[PDB]
Protein backbone atom coordinates (compact mmCIF):
# COMPACT_ATOMS: atom_id res chain seq x y z
CA UNK A 1 0.00 0.00 0.00
CA UNK A 2 1.58 3.24 -1.33
CA UNK A 3 0.80 6.57 0.41
CA UNK A 4 0.73 10.32 -0.47
CA UNK A 5 0.13 13.67 1.28
CA UNK A 6 -1.29 16.71 -0.57
CA UNK A 7 -2.18 20.27 0.46
CA UNK A 8 -4.83 22.24 -1.49
CA UNK A 9 -4.72 26.04 -0.95
CA UNK A 10 -6.83 28.86 -2.50
CA UNK A 11 -6.36 32.66 -2.43
CA UNK A 12 -9.47 34.70 -3.30
CA UNK A 13 -9.53 38.34 -4.43
CA UNK A 14 -12.69 40.48 -3.99
CA UNK A 15 -13.65 43.76 -5.81
CA UNK A 16 -13.49 45.55 -2.38
CA UNK A 17 -9.98 44.21 -1.47
CA UNK A 18 -7.83 41.66 -3.36
CA UNK A 19 -7.45 39.40 -0.25
CA UNK A 20 -10.53 38.53 2.04
CA UNK A 21 -10.71 34.70 1.50
CA UNK A 22 -7.86 32.15 2.12
CA UNK A 23 -8.43 28.35 2.36
CA UNK A 24 -5.85 25.62 3.14
CA UNK A 25 -6.93 21.92 3.09
CA UNK A 26 -4.67 18.99 4.03
CA UNK A 27 -5.19 15.45 2.70
CA UNK A 28 -3.54 12.04 3.27
CA UNK A 29 -4.50 9.83 0.25
CA UNK A 30 -8.27 10.74 0.34
CA UNK A 31 -9.01 11.59 4.01
CA UNK A 32 -8.93 15.16 5.30
CA UNK A 33 -6.90 16.02 8.43
CA UNK A 34 -6.44 19.83 8.46
CA UNK A 35 -8.52 22.84 7.30
CA UNK A 36 -7.45 26.51 7.64
CA UNK A 37 -9.88 29.35 6.83
CA UNK A 38 -9.52 33.18 7.02
CA UNK A 39 -13.33 33.79 7.17
CA UNK A 40 -13.60 31.32 10.14
CA UNK A 41 -14.06 32.81 13.66
CA UNK A 42 -11.74 32.97 15.50
CA UNK A 43 -10.75 30.05 14.60
CA UNK A 44 -13.07 27.80 16.72
CA UNK A 45 -12.96 24.60 14.55
CA UNK A 46 -9.21 24.32 15.48
CA UNK A 47 -8.00 21.53 16.15
CA UNK A 48 -10.03 19.56 13.54
CA UNK A 49 -9.15 15.81 13.02
CA UNK A 50 -9.03 13.35 16.01
CA UNK A 51 -5.50 11.90 15.41
CA UNK A 52 -4.02 15.39 14.76
CA UNK A 53 -4.92 16.82 18.23
CA UNK A 54 -2.62 14.17 19.89
CA UNK A 55 0.32 16.46 18.90
CA UNK A 56 1.07 19.26 21.40
CA UNK A 57 -0.05 22.92 21.13
CA UNK A 58 3.39 23.69 19.55
CA UNK A 59 2.26 21.74 16.41
CA UNK A 60 -0.96 23.76 15.98
CA UNK A 61 0.64 27.17 16.72
CA UNK A 62 3.33 26.44 14.06
CA UNK A 63 0.72 25.49 11.39
CA UNK A 64 -1.38 28.60 12.31
CA UNK A 65 1.86 30.68 11.90
CA UNK A 66 2.53 28.96 8.49
CA UNK A 67 -1.04 29.77 7.25
CA UNK A 68 -0.80 33.44 8.44
CA UNK A 69 2.62 33.80 6.65
CA UNK A 70 1.17 32.19 3.48
CA UNK A 71 -1.97 34.46 3.50
CA UNK A 72 0.24 37.62 3.52
CA UNK A 73 2.45 36.10 0.75
CA UNK A 74 -0.72 35.29 -1.29
CA UNK A 75 -1.90 38.96 -0.90
CA UNK A 76 1.40 40.05 -2.51
CA UNK A 77 1.04 37.34 -5.19
CA UNK A 78 -2.53 38.47 -6.07
CA UNK A 79 -1.22 42.04 -6.67
CA UNK A 80 1.76 40.89 -8.81
CA UNK A 81 -0.41 38.57 -10.98
CA UNK A 82 -2.85 41.47 -11.69
CA UNK A 83 0.01 43.57 -13.13
CA UNK A 84 1.25 40.67 -15.31
CA UNK A 85 -2.16 40.22 -17.04
CA UNK A 86 -2.94 44.01 -16.74
CA UNK A 87 -6.09 43.26 -14.66
CA UNK A 88 -8.05 45.82 -12.57
CA UNK A 89 -9.01 46.17 -8.84
CA UNK A 90 -12.70 45.72 -9.95
CA UNK A 91 -11.94 42.07 -10.84
CA UNK A 92 -12.19 39.13 -8.39
CA UNK A 93 -9.54 36.47 -9.06
CA UNK A 94 -8.38 33.06 -7.73
CA UNK A 95 -4.82 31.83 -7.00
CA UNK A 96 -4.44 28.09 -6.29
CA UNK A 97 -1.51 26.10 -4.90
CA UNK A 98 -1.12 22.29 -4.81
CA UNK A 99 1.91 20.84 -2.95
CA UNK A 100 2.81 17.41 -1.58
CA UNK A 101 4.82 14.17 -1.61
CA UNK A 102 4.40 10.62 -3.03
CA UNK A 103 5.80 7.58 -1.12
CA UNK A 104 5.92 3.83 -1.86
CA UNK A 105 5.16 0.81 0.37
CA UNK A 106 8.33 1.39 2.47
CA UNK A 107 8.15 5.19 2.96
CA UNK A 108 10.68 6.58 0.41
CA UNK A 109 9.87 9.60 -1.83
CA UNK A 110 8.97 9.00 -5.53
CA UNK A 111 7.44 12.33 -6.71
CA UNK A 112 7.53 15.85 -5.22
CA UNK A 113 4.66 18.21 -6.12
CA UNK A 114 4.52 22.03 -5.92
CA UNK A 115 2.04 23.31 -8.50
CA UNK A 116 0.41 26.75 -8.94
CA UNK A 117 -2.63 28.08 -10.89
CA UNK A 118 -4.17 31.48 -11.69
CA UNK A 119 -7.91 31.68 -12.50
CA UNK A 120 -8.30 27.94 -13.21
CA UNK A 121 -5.35 27.73 -15.64
CA UNK A 122 -1.88 26.26 -14.73
CA UNK A 123 0.73 28.92 -13.86
CA UNK A 124 4.09 27.48 -12.61
CA UNK A 125 5.05 23.88 -11.70
CA UNK A 126 8.08 22.30 -9.99
CA UNK A 127 9.77 19.60 -12.13
CA UNK A 128 10.41 15.97 -10.94
CA UNK A 129 14.18 16.74 -10.45
CA UNK A 130 13.14 19.49 -7.90
CA UNK A 131 15.69 22.04 -9.27
CA UNK A 132 13.88 23.38 -12.42
CA UNK A 133 10.43 25.00 -13.05
CA UNK A 134 7.75 24.75 -15.82
CA UNK A 135 6.10 28.01 -16.99
CA UNK A 136 2.64 27.56 -18.58
CA UNK A 137 2.46 31.14 -20.09
CA UNK A 138 4.34 34.44 -20.87
CA UNK A 139 3.66 35.90 -17.35
CA UNK A 140 4.78 32.60 -15.76
CA UNK A 141 8.26 33.15 -17.36
CA UNK A 142 8.80 36.32 -15.23
CA UNK A 143 7.97 34.39 -12.01
CA UNK A 144 10.46 31.64 -13.04
CA UNK A 145 13.35 34.16 -13.40
CA UNK A 146 12.25 35.81 -10.09
CA UNK A 147 12.22 32.36 -8.39
CA UNK A 148 15.46 30.93 -9.87
CA UNK A 149 17.37 34.07 -8.71
CA UNK A 150 15.73 33.79 -5.24
CA UNK A 151 16.66 30.00 -5.28
CA UNK A 152 13.06 29.00 -4.23
CA UNK A 153 13.50 25.43 -5.66
CA UNK A 154 16.36 24.65 -3.16
CA UNK A 155 14.02 25.24 -0.14
CA UNK A 156 11.02 23.53 -1.83
CA UNK A 157 13.08 20.35 -2.58
CA UNK A 158 14.27 20.45 1.10
CA UNK A 159 10.65 20.54 2.41
CA UNK A 160 9.43 17.71 0.10
CA UNK A 161 12.48 15.40 0.58
CA UNK A 162 12.58 16.11 4.35
CA UNK A 163 9.61 17.54 6.34
CA UNK A 164 6.92 16.11 3.94
CA UNK A 165 8.24 12.48 3.97
CA UNK A 166 9.02 12.68 7.77
CA UNK A 167 5.50 13.88 8.65
CA UNK A 168 3.56 11.56 6.28
CA UNK A 169 5.25 8.41 7.75
CA UNK A 170 4.47 9.78 11.27
CA UNK A 171 0.83 10.54 10.21
CA UNK A 172 0.53 6.89 9.01
CA UNK A 173 1.77 5.45 12.37
CA UNK A 174 -0.50 7.75 14.51
CA UNK A 175 -3.70 6.30 12.96
CA UNK A 176 -3.02 3.10 10.92
CA UNK A 177 -6.65 1.95 11.49
CA UNK A 178 -7.97 5.20 9.85
CA UNK A 179 -5.40 5.59 6.98
CA UNK A 180 -3.73 2.21 6.12
CA UNK A 181 -7.29 0.69 5.82
CA UNK A 182 -8.61 -0.48 2.41
CA UNK A 183 -12.39 -1.08 2.26
CA UNK A 184 -13.69 -3.23 -0.65
CA UNK A 185 -16.80 -2.21 -2.69
CA UNK A 186 -20.28 -3.78 -2.25
CA UNK A 187 -20.70 -4.75 -5.95
CA UNK A 188 -23.94 -5.68 -7.83
CA UNK A 189 -25.23 -5.55 -11.47
CA UNK A 190 -28.65 -4.01 -12.37
CA UNK A 191 -30.80 -4.30 -15.55
CA UNK A 192 -32.90 -1.54 -17.18
CA UNK A 193 -35.26 -2.23 -20.15
CA UNK A 194 -35.59 1.28 -21.78
CA UNK A 195 -36.30 -0.14 -25.31
CA UNK A 196 -37.66 -3.41 -26.84
CA UNK A 197 -34.48 -3.88 -28.98
CA UNK A 198 -32.02 -2.25 -26.48
CA UNK A 199 -31.25 -2.64 -22.72
CA UNK A 200 -28.92 -1.03 -20.12
CA UNK A 201 -26.51 -2.94 -17.83
CA UNK A 202 -25.12 -0.95 -14.89
CA UNK A 203 -22.21 -2.10 -12.70
CA UNK A 204 -22.22 -0.65 -9.15
CA UNK A 205 -19.56 -0.10 -6.44
CA UNK A 206 -20.45 1.24 -2.94
CA UNK A 207 -18.71 1.82 0.42
CA UNK A 208 -15.10 1.68 -0.83
CA UNK A 209 -11.86 3.42 0.27
CA UNK A 210 -9.67 4.88 -1.28
CA UNK A 211 -11.70 6.48 -4.16
CA UNK A 212 -9.19 5.21 -6.82
CA UNK A 213 -11.02 2.28 -8.54
CA UNK A 214 -11.43 0.77 -12.06
CA UNK A 215 -14.75 -0.35 -13.67
CA UNK A 216 -14.65 -1.74 -17.25
CA UNK A 217 -17.47 -3.34 -19.33
CA UNK A 218 -16.57 -5.93 -21.99
CA UNK A 219 -18.38 -8.21 -24.46
CA UNK A 220 -16.77 -11.50 -25.70
CA UNK A 221 -13.76 -10.75 -23.45
CA UNK A 222 -12.98 -7.62 -25.56
CA UNK A 223 -12.99 -4.17 -23.80
CA UNK A 224 -15.96 -1.92 -24.69
CA UNK A 225 -14.23 1.29 -23.44
CA UNK A 226 -16.12 3.43 -26.05
CA UNK A 227 -19.86 2.66 -25.46
CA UNK A 228 -19.37 2.89 -21.65
CA UNK A 229 -21.26 5.56 -19.65
CA UNK A 230 -18.72 5.85 -16.80
CA UNK A 231 -19.76 8.28 -14.02
CA UNK A 232 -17.18 10.16 -11.82
CA UNK A 233 -16.26 8.78 -8.34
CA UNK A 234 -18.75 10.49 -5.99
CA UNK A 235 -18.17 10.60 -2.17
CA UNK A 236 -20.40 9.56 0.76
CA UNK A 237 -20.77 11.45 4.07
CA UNK A 238 -18.98 8.60 5.96
CA UNK A 239 -15.39 8.49 4.47
CA UNK A 240 -16.61 6.09 1.69
CA UNK A 241 -17.06 6.45 -2.10
CA UNK A 242 -19.51 5.46 -4.90
CA UNK A 243 -19.10 4.89 -8.69
CA UNK A 244 -21.16 3.23 -11.47
CA UNK A 245 -20.58 2.15 -15.11
CA UNK A 246 -23.33 1.61 -17.75
CA UNK A 247 -23.33 0.07 -21.28
CA UNK A 248 -25.93 -0.05 -24.14
CA UNK A 249 -26.73 -3.68 -25.00
CA UNK A 250 -28.96 -5.25 -27.75
CA UNK A 251 -31.88 -7.44 -26.49
CA UNK A 252 -30.93 -11.08 -25.79
CA UNK A 253 -27.15 -10.36 -25.89
CA UNK A 254 -27.05 -9.62 -22.07
CA UNK A 255 -24.93 -12.70 -21.19
CA UNK A 256 -22.17 -11.70 -23.70
CA UNK A 257 -21.31 -8.63 -21.53
CA UNK A 258 -19.09 -8.91 -18.40
CA UNK A 259 -17.67 -6.32 -15.97
CA UNK A 260 -14.21 -6.17 -14.35
CA UNK A 261 -13.70 -4.44 -10.94
CA UNK A 262 -10.17 -3.48 -9.75
CA UNK A 263 -9.41 -2.02 -6.28
CA UNK A 264 -6.60 -2.17 -3.64
CA UNK A 265 -9.19 -3.25 -1.03
CA UNK A 266 -10.03 -6.31 -3.19
CA UNK A 267 -8.07 -9.60 -2.79
CA UNK A 268 -8.85 -10.82 -6.37
CA UNK A 269 -10.39 -8.62 -9.17
CA UNK A 270 -14.16 -9.26 -9.52
CA UNK A 271 -15.67 -10.50 -12.82
CA UNK A 272 -19.39 -9.63 -12.38
CA UNK A 273 -22.36 -10.72 -14.57
CA UNK A 274 -26.18 -10.20 -14.78
CA UNK A 275 -27.59 -13.12 -12.70
CA UNK A 276 -31.48 -12.81 -12.69
CA UNK B 1 2.72 19.62 7.86
CA UNK B 2 2.09 22.98 6.06
CA UNK B 3 4.91 24.22 3.71
CA UNK B 4 6.27 27.72 4.38
CA UNK B 5 5.45 29.80 1.28
CA UNK B 6 7.40 33.06 1.72
CA UNK B 7 8.32 33.82 -1.90
CA UNK B 8 5.50 35.73 -3.63
CA UNK B 9 4.59 35.20 -7.33
Amino acid sequence: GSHSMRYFDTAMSRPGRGEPRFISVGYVDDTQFVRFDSDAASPREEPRAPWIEQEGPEYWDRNTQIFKTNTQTDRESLRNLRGYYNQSEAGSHTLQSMYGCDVGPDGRLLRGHNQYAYDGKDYIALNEDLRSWTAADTAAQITQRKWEAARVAEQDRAYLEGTCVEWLRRYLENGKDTLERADPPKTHVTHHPISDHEATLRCWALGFYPAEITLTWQRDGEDQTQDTELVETRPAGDRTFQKWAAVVVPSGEEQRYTCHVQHEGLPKPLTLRWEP
Amino acid sequence: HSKKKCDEL
Partner: T-cell receptor, first 114, second 112 residues
Framework: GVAQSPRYKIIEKRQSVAFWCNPI?????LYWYQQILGQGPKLLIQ????????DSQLPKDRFSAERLKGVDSTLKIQPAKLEDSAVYLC?????????????FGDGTRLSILE | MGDSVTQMEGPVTLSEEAFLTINCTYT??????LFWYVQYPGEGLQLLLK?????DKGSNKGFEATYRKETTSFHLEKGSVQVSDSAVYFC??????????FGAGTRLTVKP
Protein backbone atom coordinates in the same frame (compact mmCIF):
# COMPACT_ATOMS: atom_id res chain seq x y z
CA GLY C 1 21.58 47.50 7.84
CA VAL C 2 18.70 47.46 10.35
CA ALA C 3 18.10 50.90 12.00
CA GLN C 4 16.80 51.31 15.60
CA SER C 5 15.86 54.43 17.63
CA PRO C 6 16.55 55.37 20.43
CA ARG C 7 19.86 53.68 21.40
CA TYR C 8 19.21 54.33 25.12
CA LYS C 9 16.03 55.35 27.03
CA ILE C 10 15.33 56.16 30.71
CA ILE C 11 11.76 55.62 31.95
CA GLU C 12 10.11 55.35 35.43
CA LYS C 13 7.90 52.50 36.83
CA ARG C 14 4.33 52.38 35.27
CA GLN C 15 5.30 54.88 32.48
CA SER C 16 4.88 54.22 28.71
CA VAL C 17 7.80 53.75 26.24
CA ALA C 18 8.00 53.42 22.40
CA PHE C 19 10.76 51.74 20.34
CA TRP C 20 11.09 52.33 16.59
CA CYS C 21 12.79 50.11 13.94
CA ASN C 22 13.34 50.09 10.17
CA PRO C 23 14.57 46.88 8.47
CA ILE C 24 16.90 46.45 5.47
CA UNK C 25 15.14 47.70 2.27
CA UNK C 26 12.96 44.94 0.80
CA UNK C 27 12.97 42.57 3.85
CA UNK C 28 9.36 41.24 4.09
CA UNK C 29 9.68 39.68 7.55
CA LEU C 30 10.45 41.61 10.78
CA TYR C 31 11.14 40.25 14.31
CA TRP C 32 10.99 42.00 17.72
CA TYR C 33 13.31 40.45 20.38
CA GLN C 34 14.03 40.91 24.09
CA GLN C 35 17.60 40.20 25.20
CA ILE C 36 17.66 40.19 29.03
CA LEU C 37 20.88 41.89 30.28
CA GLY C 38 23.22 38.86 30.37
CA GLN C 39 21.55 36.15 28.15
CA GLY C 40 20.25 35.16 24.64
CA PRO C 41 17.49 36.74 22.49
CA LYS C 42 13.82 35.83 23.14
CA LEU C 43 11.16 36.49 20.47
CA LEU C 44 8.31 38.92 21.34
CA ILE C 45 6.39 39.40 18.02
CA GLN C 46 6.98 38.43 14.33
CA UNK C 47 5.53 40.14 11.22
CA UNK C 48 5.31 39.06 7.55
CA UNK C 49 4.60 42.32 5.62
CA UNK C 50 1.81 44.26 7.45
CA UNK C 51 0.41 41.24 9.36
CA UNK C 52 1.34 39.47 12.62
CA UNK C 53 2.52 35.82 12.27
CA UNK C 54 3.39 35.03 15.95
CA ASP C 55 2.48 36.87 19.21
CA SER C 56 2.08 33.87 21.61
CA GLN C 57 5.19 35.01 23.56
CA LEU C 58 4.08 38.69 23.60
CA PRO C 59 2.33 39.57 26.92
CA LYS C 60 -0.82 41.44 25.67
CA ASP C 61 -1.32 43.21 29.07
CA ARG C 62 1.60 45.68 28.55
CA PHE C 63 3.23 44.91 25.16
CA SER C 64 1.98 45.93 21.69
CA ALA C 65 3.56 46.34 18.21
CA GLU C 66 2.47 47.68 14.79
CA ARG C 67 3.91 47.41 11.24
CA LEU C 68 0.82 49.06 9.64
CA LYS C 69 2.50 49.76 6.26
CA GLY C 70 4.68 46.59 6.09
CA VAL C 71 8.00 48.52 6.31
CA ASP C 72 9.00 50.13 9.67
CA SER C 73 7.66 48.88 13.03
CA THR C 74 6.88 50.40 16.48
CA LEU C 75 7.11 48.30 19.68
CA LYS C 76 5.25 49.95 22.60
CA ILE C 77 5.16 49.11 26.33
CA GLN C 78 2.05 50.23 28.32
CA PRO C 79 2.47 50.62 32.21
CA ALA C 80 6.11 49.34 32.29
CA LYS C 81 7.44 47.04 35.05
CA LEU C 82 10.97 46.72 36.63
CA GLU C 83 11.55 43.29 34.96
CA ASP C 84 11.21 44.92 31.48
CA SER C 85 14.72 46.49 31.98
CA ALA C 86 16.60 44.80 29.07
CA VAL C 87 18.02 45.44 25.56
CA TYR C 88 15.20 45.40 22.97
CA LEU C 89 16.60 43.88 19.79
CA CYS C 90 15.04 43.91 16.35
CA UNK C 91 15.90 41.73 13.37
CA UNK C 92 14.67 41.16 9.79
CA UNK C 93 14.82 38.52 7.04
CA UNK C 94 14.39 38.90 3.24
CA UNK C 95 11.40 36.47 3.22
CA UNK C 96 12.40 34.15 6.15
CA UNK C 97 12.72 31.22 5.06
CA UNK C 98 14.90 28.92 7.17
CA UNK C 99 17.91 29.10 4.79
CA UNK C 100 17.86 32.96 5.03
CA UNK C 101 19.69 34.47 8.07
CA UNK C 102 18.22 37.19 10.32
CA UNK C 103 19.88 40.65 10.36
CA PHE C 104 19.90 42.37 13.79
CA GLY C 105 19.83 46.06 14.72
CA ASP C 106 21.97 47.76 17.38
CA GLY C 107 19.10 47.41 19.91
CA THR C 108 17.55 49.78 22.46
CA ARG C 109 18.90 49.71 26.04
CA LEU C 110 15.96 50.34 28.42
CA SER C 111 16.44 51.19 32.11
CA ILE C 112 13.33 51.28 34.34
CA LEU C 113 13.97 53.35 37.48
CA GLU C 114 12.05 53.54 40.80
CA MET D 1 9.20 20.19 14.00
CA GLY D 2 11.89 19.48 16.65
CA ASP D 3 13.29 21.85 17.81
CA SER D 4 16.19 22.67 20.16
CA VAL D 5 19.81 23.94 20.15
CA THR D 6 22.21 23.37 23.06
CA GLN D 7 25.35 25.52 23.38
CA MET D 8 28.53 24.98 25.49
CA GLU D 9 28.29 25.90 29.23
CA GLY D 10 30.12 28.74 31.03
CA PRO D 11 32.74 31.26 29.87
CA VAL D 12 35.58 29.91 27.68
CA THR D 13 38.96 31.43 28.59
CA LEU D 14 41.96 30.82 26.32
CA SER D 15 45.38 32.24 25.44
CA GLU D 16 46.12 33.91 22.07
CA GLU D 17 47.17 31.63 19.11
CA ALA D 18 45.42 28.65 20.87
CA PHE D 19 42.87 26.28 19.25
CA LEU D 20 39.18 27.17 19.84
CA THR D 21 36.24 24.71 19.98
CA ILE D 22 32.70 25.83 20.92
CA ASN D 23 30.23 22.91 21.05
CA CYS D 24 26.69 22.95 19.65
CA THR D 25 24.17 20.09 19.19
CA TYR D 26 20.65 20.19 17.66
CA THR D 27 17.41 18.18 17.41
CA UNK D 28 15.59 18.75 14.10
CA UNK D 29 13.59 16.52 11.72
CA UNK D 30 14.55 16.91 8.05
CA UNK D 31 17.12 19.23 6.46
CA UNK D 32 17.83 22.26 8.73
CA UNK D 33 20.06 25.32 8.16
CA LEU D 34 22.71 26.15 10.80
CA PHE D 35 24.24 29.50 11.83
CA TRP D 36 26.87 31.06 14.12
CA TYR D 37 26.35 34.59 15.46
CA VAL D 38 28.83 36.88 17.23
CA GLN D 39 28.03 39.72 19.69
CA TYR D 40 31.02 42.02 20.32
CA PRO D 41 30.84 44.23 23.51
CA GLY D 42 28.35 47.09 23.04
CA GLU D 43 27.21 46.15 19.49
CA GLY D 44 24.24 43.90 18.63
CA LEU D 45 24.19 40.47 16.96
CA GLN D 46 25.95 39.83 13.62
CA LEU D 47 26.16 36.71 11.40
CA LEU D 48 29.55 34.95 11.60
CA LEU D 49 29.03 31.90 9.30
CA LYS D 50 26.27 29.66 7.79
CA UNK D 51 25.75 26.09 6.41
CA UNK D 52 22.33 25.33 4.79
CA UNK D 53 22.71 22.12 2.68
CA UNK D 54 24.13 18.82 4.10
CA UNK D 55 28.00 18.78 4.40
CA ASP D 56 28.22 22.58 3.71
CA LYS D 57 31.56 24.14 4.76
CA GLY D 58 30.76 27.68 6.02
CA SER D 59 33.76 29.78 7.17
CA ASN D 60 34.64 33.45 7.95
CA LYS D 61 37.75 35.25 9.39
CA GLY D 62 39.55 32.06 10.51
CA PHE D 63 36.39 30.45 12.00
CA GLU D 64 35.04 27.07 10.78
CA ALA D 65 31.89 25.00 11.54
CA THR D 66 30.92 22.06 9.28
CA TYR D 67 27.31 20.77 9.12
CA ARG D 68 27.44 16.98 9.75
CA LYS D 69 23.99 15.33 9.28
CA GLU D 70 25.27 11.95 10.63
CA THR D 71 26.39 13.30 14.07
CA THR D 72 23.89 16.27 14.47
CA SER D 73 26.54 18.81 15.61
CA PHE D 74 27.78 22.29 14.55
CA HIS D 75 31.02 23.00 16.48
CA LEU D 76 32.77 26.37 16.03
CA GLU D 77 36.54 25.99 15.46
CA LYS D 78 39.56 28.33 14.96
CA GLY D 79 43.26 27.34 14.78
CA SER D 80 44.91 30.61 15.92
CA VAL D 81 42.51 32.45 18.25
CA GLN D 82 42.95 36.28 18.51
CA VAL D 83 42.36 38.74 21.43
CA SER D 84 39.81 40.53 19.11
CA ASP D 85 37.67 37.29 19.16
CA SER D 86 36.72 37.92 22.86
CA ALA D 87 32.88 38.13 22.49
CA VAL D 88 29.64 36.17 23.13
CA TYR D 89 28.89 33.51 20.49
CA PHE D 90 25.45 32.09 19.61
CA CYS D 91 24.49 29.03 17.55
CA UNK D 92 21.22 29.20 15.56
CA UNK D 93 18.86 26.50 14.20
CA UNK D 94 16.07 26.73 11.62
CA UNK D 95 14.48 24.18 9.24
CA UNK D 96 11.98 24.78 6.30
CA UNK D 97 8.99 24.89 8.76
CA UNK D 98 10.63 26.21 11.99
CA UNK D 99 11.77 29.80 12.68
CA UNK D 100 15.34 30.53 13.95
CA UNK D 101 16.10 29.32 17.53
CA PHE D 102 19.16 30.47 19.53
CA GLY D 103 21.49 28.70 21.95
CA ALA D 104 22.13 30.04 25.51
CA GLY D 105 25.36 31.76 24.38
CA THR D 106 29.01 30.94 25.14
CA ARG D 107 31.21 33.89 26.17
CA LEU D 108 34.80 33.68 24.88
CA THR D 109 37.68 35.53 26.62
CA VAL D 110 41.06 35.49 24.83
CA LYS D 111 44.07 36.39 27.05
CA PRO D 112 47.26 37.80 25.40
Amino acid sequence: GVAQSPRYKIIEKRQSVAFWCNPISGHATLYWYQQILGQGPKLLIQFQNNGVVDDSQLPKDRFSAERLKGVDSTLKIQPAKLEDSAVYLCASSLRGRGDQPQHFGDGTRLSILE
Amino acid sequence: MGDSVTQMEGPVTLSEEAFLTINCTYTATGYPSLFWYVQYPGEGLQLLLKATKADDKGSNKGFEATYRKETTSFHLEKGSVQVSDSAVYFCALSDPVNDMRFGAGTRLTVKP
